[PDB]
Amino acid sequence: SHMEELQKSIGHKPEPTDEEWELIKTVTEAHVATNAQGSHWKQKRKFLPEDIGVDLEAFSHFTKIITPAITRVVDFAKKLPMFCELPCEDQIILLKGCCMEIMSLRAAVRYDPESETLTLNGEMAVTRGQLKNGGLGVVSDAIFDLGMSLSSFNLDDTEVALLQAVLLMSSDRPGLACVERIEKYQDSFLLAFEHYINYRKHHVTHFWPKLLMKVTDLRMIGACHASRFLHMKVECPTELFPPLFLEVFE
Numbered sequence: 001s002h003m004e005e006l007q008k009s010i011g012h013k014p015e016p017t018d019e020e021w022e023l024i025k026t027v028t029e030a031h032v033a034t035n036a037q038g039s040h041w042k043q044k045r046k047f048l049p050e051d052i053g054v055d056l057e058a059f060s061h062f063t064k065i066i067t068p069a070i071t072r073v074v075d076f077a078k079k080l081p082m083f084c085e086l087p088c089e090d091q092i093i094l095l096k097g098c099c100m101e102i103m104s105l106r107a108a109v110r111y112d113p114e115s116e117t118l119t120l121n122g123e124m125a126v127t128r129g130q131l132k133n134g135g136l137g138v139v140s141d142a143i144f145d146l147g148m149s150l151s152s153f154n155l156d157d158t159e160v161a162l163l164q165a166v167l168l169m170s171s172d173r174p175g176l177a178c179v180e181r182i183e184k185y186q187d188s189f190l191l192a193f194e195h196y197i198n199y200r201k202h203h204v205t206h207f208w209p210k211l212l213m214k215v216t217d218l219r220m221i222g223a224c225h226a227s228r229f230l231h232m233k234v235e236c237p238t239e240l241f242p243p244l245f246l247e248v249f250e
């Protein structure tokens with residue numbers, strides 16, 4: 001009985017309703033499925049040679065593995081019924097919007113402080129420099145700084161999945177038709193996410209506000225990548241652009 005605000009005047013911290021656990025199980029599984037190499041990534045990963053890394057040899061490695069990265073985000077979305085409930089133009093609009101946001105999140109949570117690397121596609125471990133010089137520029141710094149910061153959040157697969165869901169259901173992308181409906185699905189994810197955090201009892205003060213701030217930072221990564229993507233088309237050759245890469249980023 002979502003009295004919600006009232007339960008937040010008394011100071012109780014509401015856990016997930018029965019319906020919310022269902023939504024949480026769906027999003028979680030969507031993610032775990034489409035997350036290249038689940039919990040097995042730290043030993044499955046080849047460090048890219050110190051000598052590689054606009055440095056074009058670098059770029060070519062990242063573009064080689066980017067089409068599967070993209071598609072595993074479309075797959076994450078497909079596995080959300082709310083996404084299925086939307087028109088075809090809206091779906092494409094939402095994906096193009098969140099694709100880098102999600103991929104960046106997936107990379108940043110595989111930050112390893114021992115090596116100072118992130119791991120892409122669960123397949124390849126890069127440094128900040130290698131990722132910067134291979135085309136991202138300062139978006140690399142953005143992602144590394146983020147990964148470094150999410151170290152203390154200790155996110156679990158559910159937390160990352162819900163974050164992905166919040167990024168996907170963004171009502172402000174341009175061109176959308178079903179805005180109010182996307183906002184409602186969003187609010188539904190945020191409400192379950194908060195609830196799930198209450199349940200997790202993280203030992204960090206002001207955990208939720210803090211994690212919402214990361215949504216923004218992800219958004220910024222994405223914006224900033226759009227711009228990097230123009231700087232790229234002029235520097236690297238139309239040749240090394242996987243078709244799907246082009247179609248998502250336009």
Ligand SMILES: N[C@@H](Cc1cc(I)c(Oc2cc(I)c(O)c(I)c2)c(I)c1)C(=O)O
Pocket residue numbers: 036059061062063065066069072100103104106107119120121122134135136143
């Ligand atoms: N690790 C994620 C996927 C992921 C793949 C790549 I490859 C990547 O790096 C780039 C590099 C360039 I250059 C681009 O132009 C773009 I978009 C992404 C990032 I960050 C994330 C996953 O597990 O799903």
